[PDB]
Structure 1
Amino acid sequence: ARIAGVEIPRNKRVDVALTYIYGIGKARAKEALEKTGINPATRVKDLTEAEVVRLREYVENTWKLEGELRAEVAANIKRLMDIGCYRGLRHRRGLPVRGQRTRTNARTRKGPRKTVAG
């Protein structure tokens, strides 16, 4: 049931399925199935043309999803990065940004360990 900018959830419950949409997840799932009054447990394949239409309508108009959403974040980071901003540098140098200790566990933001001679 291609909803948000070319989505495709199927064979699984709609809520769980709606998730596969970028800007969507658990929370916003209920909201859409709640307001759009569709049973959350129906298989996307068991949906009604009348419901899919409705769903898409709410979801696509109410929240910034997929591609567009990314564009925003991208530009958001490039922003505090274009400006002197400290967080900018961190995004630049590549080290964490939410004031965490880098002497150790910072692998997720740093990547594989580039071991050097001691």
Structure 2
Amino acid sequence: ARIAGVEIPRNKRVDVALTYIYGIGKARAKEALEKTGINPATRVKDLTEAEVVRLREYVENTWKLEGELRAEVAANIKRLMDIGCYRGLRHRRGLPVRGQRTRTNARTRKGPRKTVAG
């Protein structure tokens, strides 16, 4: 059902379902299903109400998820820029922060390609 915030996964394996949770990838879902003692293979519609309550219990507060996660990331970047770090400048200009070549590629960061005269 409704787990860790406003998102409800449905009608497919519970692990893969938990993937639809923001702060939760494959590994964290595997772990959660393990410590919650739930068979992963069961469809979400087949989840016992009890199992759902237990899953919620674990997942909601162990790791920081969803909104608080996004706010944490945003605050991290904000901190990076405020102090006037190089990383912060790269975030500012919207260029690769991880030290990759910008002469070519780096399109993912720079988005669409804006062409001028030669």
* TM-score bracket for this pair, using the shorter chain length: over 0.9
Query: Residue in 1 aligned with 2:97?
Result: 97
Q: 1:6 Cα deviation (Å)?
A: 1.1
Percent of counterpart pairs with the same letter? 100
CA distance in 2, matches of 1:99, 1:54: 43
Q: 1:7 Cα deviation (Å)?
A: 1.3
The CA deviation string for residues 57-106 of structure 1, in whole angstroms up to 9 with x for no partner, is 00001000001100000000000110010000000000110000000010
The CA deviation string for residues 11-70 of structure 1, in whole angstroms up to 9 with x for no partner, is 010000000000001000111000000000100000000000000000001000001100
Runs of 4+ that moved beyond 3 A: none
Q: How many residues are treated as equivalent by the alignment?
A: 118
State the Cα RMSD in Å. Answer: 0.5
SS at match of 2:5: helix
Q: 1:110 Cα deviation (Å)?
A: 0.2
In the alignment, structure 2 segments of 5+ residues that lack a partner are none
1:87 and 2:87 are equivalent in the alignment: yes
Query: Residue in 2 aligned with 1:63?
Result: 63
Q: TM-score, normalised by structure 1?
A: 0.99
CA distance in 1, matches of 2:7, 2:31: 18
| Mapping for residues 1-118 of structure 1, pairs under 5 Å | 1-118=1-118
In the alignment, structure 1 segments of 5+ residues that lack a partner are none
